[PDB]
């Protein structure tokens, strides 16, 4: 058999990979976030210069397989205050935003269509009527609670996914005093937080998610897993047309490979490219978290400058990055 630290080998009790540990809080650092939620689209292979001192491929180039995760900006819909107790952390109270998008309202219902859409109705009414209760609760969190987690949901509509329920979750707000975290959450109420503001493509992060099920084996598969030290290679912007165009390559193109991502679609929003494989198949939600413990060796610290990113047809033996140059080489078709 395998390692005894992973048994009992049973199905994960959650579709979305839940964070089990957040980086330790620091008052010296100002107020920011630590985790983000994305959707796996697939991976390609890229050619990257190797600036690895002491290595035998120093000042050379290697080919690396890199997973692409679409990460549309996340909407902060609430905040949760946690108070330390002799029996552990306890959720003291929760404050939600006044207006919640249908994407996050669909989470509370198994049948949103048959529902009367009554979620947060009186909550929105009391929010508009009197703000003294909201002020009392926020003052309660900043005075008593020691850990602050913002409720954020993903804009699943932008992703080419048939699912319309947003994966609501909590992001621990590490940095500054408790009042600073509360002020940060209130300012960011109803707004959007971007992965460009959270991660910046040169740090060492961990990816967590549920693996894909292999059926029945002599149970094997569909288990919660935590990959450590997955390096971000590029946080590409969806709007920019140079997202998949490096400086050594030009050739204006998009990260979505020609022919589309297999069983996922076309990536149009901000995407994240991580070195190596990540758990879960395509179209499954993955969670990203910062480094709990600081460890930047040369591999985790060296800068990265991509040279060429493959966008060939992953469906089948693709042999052309873009239909433009495909038509330039291939003879003119009958159509």
């Amino acid at each position: 058999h395998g390692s005894l630290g992973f048994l009992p080998r049973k199905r994960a009790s959650r579709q979305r990979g839940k964070v089990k540990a957040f980086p330790k809080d620091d008052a010296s650092k100002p107020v920011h976030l630590t985790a983000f939620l994305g959707y796996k689209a697939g991976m390609t292979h890229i050619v990257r210069d190797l600036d690895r001192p002491g290595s035998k491929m120093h000042k050379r180039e290697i080919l690396e397989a890199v997973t692409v995760i679409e990460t549309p900006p996340m909407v902060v819909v609430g905040v949760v205050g946690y108070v330390e107790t002799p029996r552990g952390l306890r959720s003291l109270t929760t404050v939600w935003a006044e207006h919640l998008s249908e994407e996050v309202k669909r989470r509370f219902y198994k049948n949103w269509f048959k529902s009367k859409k009554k979620a947060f109705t009186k909550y929105a009414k009391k929010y508009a009527e009197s703000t003294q209760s909201i002020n009392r609760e926020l003052e309660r969190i900043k005075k008593y609670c020691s850990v602050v987690r913002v409720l954020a949901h993903t804009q699943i509509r932008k992703t080419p996914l048939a699912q319309k329920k947003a994966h609501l979750m909590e992001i621990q707000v590490n940095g500054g005093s408790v009042a600073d975290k509360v002020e940060w959450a209130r300012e960011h109420f109803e707004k959007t937080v971007d992965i460009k503001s959270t991660f910046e493509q040169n740090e060492m992060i961990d990816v967590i998610g549920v693996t894909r099920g292999k059926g029945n084996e002599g149970n094997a598969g569909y288990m919660h897993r935590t990959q450590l030290n997955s390096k971000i290679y590029r946080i590409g912007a969806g709007d920019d047309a140079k997202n998949a165009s490096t400086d050594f390559d030009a050739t204006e193109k998009r990260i979505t490979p020609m022919g589309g991502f297999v069983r996922y679609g076309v990536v149009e929003n901000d995407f994240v490219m991580l070195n190596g494989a990540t758990p879960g198949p395509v179209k499954r939600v993955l969670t990203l978290r910062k480094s709990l413990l600081t460890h930047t060796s040369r591999k985790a610290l060296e800068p990265v400058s991509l040279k060429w990113i493959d966008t060939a047809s992953k469906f089948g033996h693709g042999r052309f990055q873009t239909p433009a140059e495909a038509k330039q080489f291939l003879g003119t078709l009958k159509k």
């Binding site: 650092k29 920011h32 460009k196 991660f199 600081t294």
Partner: protein, 35 residues
């Protein structure tokens, strides 16, 4: 070879936290924070 729980290795990890780490990561968080 020594394992990852080597007491000296933990000591050297602590020493290198304030040498090739820490400060360059704190301001790195600050930059995307003010963003």
């Amino acid at each position: 070879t020594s394992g990852p729980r080597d007491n000296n290795r933990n000591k050297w990890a602590k020493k290198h936290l304030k040498k090739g780490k820490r400060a360059k990561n704190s301001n790195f968080s600050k930059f995307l924070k003010k963003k």
